[PDB]
Amino acid sequence: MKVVKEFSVCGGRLIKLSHNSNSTKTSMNVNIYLPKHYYAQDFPRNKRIPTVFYLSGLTCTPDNASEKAFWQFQADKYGFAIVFPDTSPRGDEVANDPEGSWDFGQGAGFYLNATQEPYAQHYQMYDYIHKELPQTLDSHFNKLDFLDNVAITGHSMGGYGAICGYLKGYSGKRYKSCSAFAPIVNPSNVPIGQKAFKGYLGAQWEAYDPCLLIKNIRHVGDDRILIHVGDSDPFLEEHLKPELLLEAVKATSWQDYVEIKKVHGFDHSYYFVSTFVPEHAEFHARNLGLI
Amino acid sequence: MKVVKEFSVCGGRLIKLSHNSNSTKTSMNVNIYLPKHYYAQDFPRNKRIPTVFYLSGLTCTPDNASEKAFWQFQADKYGFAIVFPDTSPRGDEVANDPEGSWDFGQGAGFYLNATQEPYAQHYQMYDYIHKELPQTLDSHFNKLDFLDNVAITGHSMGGYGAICGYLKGYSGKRYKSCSAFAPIVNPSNVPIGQKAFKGYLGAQWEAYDPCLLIKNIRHVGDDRILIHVGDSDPFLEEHLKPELLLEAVKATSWQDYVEIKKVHGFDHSYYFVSTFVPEHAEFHARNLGLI
């Protein structure tokens, strides 16, 4: 893992890293913010700094959310690290949308393990995020926990990947906390999701659809999914349709445990995301035992 | 004044405006964030929401600082509005750097009233910021004060314009508060400043140089200039040289009232700026009588 660039921000440091990925077979870019706690003189030996993984939306790189969501202030506030993965494999060797669009191909992996050629070669974003990356960060830094006491969140395509990873890992307690911002919640039933699934996967889709996954996953204790979405989000009725997760949990053990806050006047933008980052941070902090 | 685009952010609203400018003779773009106080049901008739004007650096538009500094949270915290002007006149009719560079011409007005053709035609950024814009916002919105109880701040070229406006307006109490982030402080003695001055102005420079202005301006009461600058700022030794303002006030009524916080490890970037926005906000809030 190479340090490409470091920025002091708040009391910690935002680090731009790269590494040769075994899942993607390409160089991958990742950012991590390390909180003030990591640089502090007295950090207790019987504590670990837990990690939040923030998954970005379509066309994004790690830098968009790093610059525009202000997680760094929350990170110092509660004592967690936050990791910002990229959104697809990238490179001259990596397949693109044959239609030359932005909703598929590069910047648009949909957090899936692709089975269809030519994408299967590089598009192993599910193993990348849940299997390789935490271990890679662990080998490089190890104060920090990338593997155990970990939260997952993200925006749009990323809230989708977040919810999806949380649910598929739920019996193993893979993630201790799950939130999302304007997620795509039922990919199988929405145009954007169907193109990603047809393209990357070619019945294989069910394993990647939160609305189908959640129904037979036995809810435990007080666990819940925090969602925010703006009612002025221009993608809301065609792509996101959050109401669909609500409907999916009716008469199900998850029924009272998916909280969608639909927030009047708000967008899809990082103006929206930055506004709800404080609440999501405190939600993740409590689930991580920081407060 | 036209509303081009509105975004809910925090409890207020970020508004992208445009207007036909009489100072520049061109369309100008401006952003303003209005705090939660402005939309609130009970806002007292014997109060006005005071305004912070944030001046941006070279190549910037209003949107950079709007997206990347998170003033909006401070604005709701203390009860001020924040205005983000543009950095030059813009348009197909507006003169550029004959050298095709970014440090002069468009995005690079240096908050000056240009006297030299072809720039004089549009480059009236000093009257634009201090004379036209506050009155224009006043006519459009009038809860709000754009004219009287007003603070000025900004980054690099903008901290320069901020300091410069504050000092030239100081006997008239034009601005009630002045801070800056990584300002250029002695334009007459630094390469970037000399090119702007030679280009826009052609003795005419003194009137626009904070290090020359401050020495005979009689300091009153407890007033002070707040500056932050990072010691890893790559422009620090060639262009910014903050130490120069310090030297300028030695044996002067301003001597103990220019506070430069040189902050270890920090950049020129909005990672730096966003880190010190909370402190600057509380400093401006107190000078504005909000706290």
UniProtKB/Swiss-Prot annotation, chains A, B:
Temperature effects on activity: Optimum temperature is 50 degrees Celsius.
Q: Which residues bind Cu cation?
A: 1, 140
List the keywords (alphabetical).
Answer: Copper, Cytoplasm, Hydrolase, Metal-binding, Serine esterase
Presence of keyword Metal-binding: yes
Gene Ontology MF term list: carboxylic ester hydrolase activity; metal ion binding; S-formylglutathione hydrolase activity
Provide GO CC annotations from the record: cytosol
Q: Name one GO biological process term.
A: formaldehyde catabolic process
Q: Which SUPFAM superfamilies match?
A: alpha/beta-Hydrolases (SSF53474)
Q: Which InterPro entries match?
A: AB_hydrolase_fold, Esterase-like, S-formylglutathione_hydrol
Q: What is its EC number?
A: 3.1.2.12
Q: Which reaction equations make up its catalytic activity?
A: S-formylglutathione + H2O = formate + glutathione + H(+)
Active site, UniProt feature? 156, 233, 268
Give the pH dependence of activity as annotated. Answer: Optimum pH is 7.
What does the miscellaneous comment read? Present with 1750 molecules/cell in log phase SD medium.
Family designation: Belongs to the esterase D family.
Q: How does it assemble?
A: Monomer.
Please explain the role this protein plays, according to its UniProt record.
Answer: Serine hydrolase involved in the detoxification of formaldehyde.
State what protein this is by name: S-formylglutathione hydrolase
Species this protein is from: Saccharomyces cerevisiae (strain ATCC 204508 / S288c)
What does the organism's lineage look like at the top?
Answer: Eukaryota, Fungi, Dikarya, Ascomycota, Saccharomycotina
